[PDB]
Structure formats: structure tokens, C-alpha cells
């Protein structure tokens, strides 16, 4: 949601991305802001979005599951992540091969 959040988490503590942060034309904090620790679960959601755009289905699924399993994310964000992301994109998932372990943990 919007772009300055987006920008800042994905540019990390390296000068990556040319996308200016906030409504300012500054490149200054596009070489800083590596959403980590507390912002780590939040960082991982924005990155899951980057991965769809850079056409990964494998690493994309993986990031989405990681957050679903995390017991310190709310329980009420169950039906929300699966309904919007996993449910339409049923095909892409279906193509991929899932073992006994991944299925049982989910």
C-alpha cells in the first residue's frame, strides 16, 4: 500500500532501487532503511509482492507461508491472506509439488 513504505523496505541498507523515498526527490534514505527485527514480518510482506513481479512462484509461496505459520502474527489474518492470494492463484500453486511435511504443518 502506497509506495514510500514499499520503497524503503525493498531498497534495504544498500543503495538498491532508484525509487525516491517519500514525496521527496531524496535518494538519501534509499541507501538506508533495512526493515528488520520488529519490521521484519512487515518487510517480508512487501518483498512477497516484489517476488510476484520478478516472476517467482516458488519463493513467493514460501514467503506467504512463512508469515501464516508465525504465531505472533494475529489469528484473524488467516482467512485474509489465503482468501486474496492463495485462493485465486490456485493454478500456480497446483503446478508445484508439495510433500507430506509442508501439507501437515499448514
Amino acid at each position: 500500500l502506497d509506495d514510500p513504505v514499499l520503497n524503503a523496505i525493498v531498497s534495504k541498507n544498500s543503495p538498491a532501487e532508484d525509487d525516491v523515498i517519500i514525496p521527496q526527490d531524496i535518494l538519501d534514505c534509499v541507501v538506508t532503511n533495512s526493515m528488520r527485527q520488529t519490521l521484519a514480518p512487515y518487510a517480508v510482506l512487501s518483498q512477497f509482492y516484489e517476488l510476484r513481479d520478478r516472476e517467482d512462484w516458488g519463493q513467493a509461496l514460501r514467503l506467504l507461508l512463512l508469515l501464516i505459520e508465525f504465531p505472533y502474527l494475529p489469528k484473524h489474518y488467516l482467512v485474509l491472506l489465503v482468501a486474496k492470494f492463495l485462493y485465486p492463484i490456485f493454478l500456480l500453486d497446483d503446478k508445484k509439488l508439495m510433500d507430506e511435511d509442508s501439507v501437515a504443518t499448514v
Partner: peptide, 14 residues
């Protein structure tokens, strides 16, 4: 591991 660590200590105190 980062996120788990910090929150896991936080519950234990609480």
C-alpha cells in the same frame, strides 16, 4: 532468529 526472538522474550516476561 530476529522477529521470533524479540517477541518470545516479550511474552515470557509478560
Amino acid at each position: 532468529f530476529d522477529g521470533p526472538c524479540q517477541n518470545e522474550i516479550d511474552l515470557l516476561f509478560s
